[PDB]
Symmetry: D2
Subunit: 21 residues, 4 copies
């Protein structure tokens, strides 16, 4: 789920992780 | 939209922004 | 924030509200 | 990635996937 060269999918996965400790 | 002190709503907003320039 | 036919901003906002309700 | 009984993780994954095809 990239948006041009931004790794959107991965950044959201990382946000979910960090939000959960 | 928070999980304890983490502002999940704002962090998600910041990603949508960062992914959009 | 659009992806084709999706108002991605609004679809995300829906999931936030569905979950927090 | 749950909020109570709501599987946020999975509903997000489904949204991304469906909006990409």
């Amino acid at each position: 789920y990239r948006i041009x060269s931004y790794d959107f999918x991965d950044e959201l996965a990382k946000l979910l992780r960090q939000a959960a400790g």
